[PDB]
Design an enzyme around this catalytic site. Structure first.
Site, PDB file in Angstrom:
ATOM      1  N   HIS A   6       1.590   6.128  -3.127  1.00 18.67           N
ATOM      2  CA  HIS A   6       1.814   4.925  -3.518  1.00 18.67           C
ATOM      3  C   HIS A   6       2.185   3.836  -2.102  1.00 18.67           C
ATOM      4  O   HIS A   6       2.641   4.047  -1.321  1.00 18.67           O
ATOM      5  CB  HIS A   6       3.372   4.852  -3.873  1.00 18.67           C
ATOM      6  CG  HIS A   6       3.547   5.863  -5.842  1.00 18.67           C
ATOM      7  ND1 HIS A   6       2.515   5.011  -6.032  1.00 18.67           N
ATOM      8  CD2 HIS A   6       4.322   6.900  -6.200  1.00 18.67           C
ATOM      9  CE1 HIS A   6       2.871   5.884  -7.331  1.00 18.67           C
ATOM     10  NE2 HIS A   6       3.949   6.715  -6.897  1.00 18.67           N
TER      11      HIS A   6
ATOM     12  N   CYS B  92      -1.013   1.826  -3.736  1.00 18.03           N
ATOM     13  CA  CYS B  92      -0.592   0.941  -4.775  1.00 18.03           C
ATOM     14  C   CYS B  92      -0.555  -0.427  -3.925  1.00 18.03           C
ATOM     15  O   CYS B  92      -0.373  -1.002  -3.584  1.00 18.03           O
ATOM     16  CB  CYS B  92       0.817   1.014  -5.195  1.00 18.03           C
ATOM     17  SG  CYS B  92       1.575   2.983  -5.260  1.00 18.03           S
TER      18      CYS B  92
END
Lengths: 72, 133, 70, 132
Positions: free
Chosen positions: B91, B133
């Site tokens: 992430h 992300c």
């Protein structure tokens, strides 16, 4: 996003259970052309491959020469 | 000064391909699992081997382990190597990636391989693939 | 970082000019109507590192780009 | 599906090459003069025009003028052009460039050419060149 730390850095950025669009397309392309095309040429093929899925990856180059992975 | 010029790629070794693969995270960071990431990890592993890389994978490193591992490879001679690849599958957040524990600034990892800190990669490609992300 | 497909962003980082633009311009003039544009931009990375700065470019280009003459 | 594939560059016109060149600034910005910038602007003009661009410069525009200009160039049809180029020669902070006046975020500027807003550049190179 972060951009190359310095000379001869290339950053490659991406933006189900069998993986992710980007890596899949990145990998397919390495397997098909990694050993002959210029790497950014190759990455550019990754950009095209991905943008047809239904996202655009990107790459940022501080490379100073052509990069190829010919079999050693 | 030659527009056709290629990085010299004729060293004994192609070089290392480092993959940090992060699937599940410290509970309190409240971040979801990355369900495809292991497929991605093996897929890069296979590809980068075929191209001659010495693929070293690490899964779900805590930040301490991650930083000491990448510092370790930043400090080995790459004198015999064509180039260096490093991949982060995790992430993201601002200009940070998550380890299992905590977020780390990407600059902090890339800077370990600038010239003044890794003489043996000066002039060779240092490739970073970030899937975040 | 580029806005979408086929965006290409070129980034730089004395009354006669910036190192970046003088070098981008010299390469445009010499090689701009024959080389692929990213190839040319890479030459510009090299030419600017030789000055004793490193520029860079971020491609969302989907194909090869040339400026062959019309 | 072809690794050698190249952009269509066979259109009537090459396209427009907007340059936004900023030398001096609204003095409460307290930004130094950018001395060599006009040399840069002219040198860019020469080279791009040599590649058959229609080069269009603007010096020291304020945010509003800058915006409605770029907004114009993005609202005209590029139906009959190969690509589009846009240069910003100025000061830069964050993801912002400065007009004479105030800073403007670069996503705002480029977004005017993403496909959903600028039909007629769909599939065509959009080159941005930023000397901040």
């Amino acid at each position: 996003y972060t951009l190359p730390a310095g000379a001869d850095f290339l950053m490659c950025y991406s933006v189900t259970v069998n993986g992710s669009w980007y890596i899949q397309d990145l990998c397919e392309m390495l397997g098909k052309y990694g050993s002959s095309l210029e790497f950014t040429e190759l990455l550019t093929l990754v950009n095209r491959k991905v943008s047809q899925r239904r996202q655009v990856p990107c790459f940022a180059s501080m490379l100073t020469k052509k990069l190829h992975f010919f079999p050693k | 000064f030659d527009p056709a010029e290629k990085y010299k790629m004729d060293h004994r070794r192609r070089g290392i391909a480092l993959i940090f693969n992060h699937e599940r995270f410290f509970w309190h960071l409240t971040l979801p699992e990355r369900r495809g990431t292991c497929a991605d990890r093996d897929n890069l592993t296979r590809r980068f081997s075929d191209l001659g890389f010495e693929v070293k994978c690490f899964n779900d490193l805590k930040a301490e382990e991650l930083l000491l591992k990448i510092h370790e490879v930043s400090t080995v001679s790459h004198a015999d190597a064509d180039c260096f690849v490093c991949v982060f599958l995790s992430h993201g957040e601002g200009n940070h990636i998550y380890a299992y524990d905590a977020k780390i600034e990407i600059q902090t990892l890339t800077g370990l391989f600038k010239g003044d800190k890794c003489h043996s990669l000066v002039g060779k490609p240092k490739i970073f693939i970030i899937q975040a992300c």
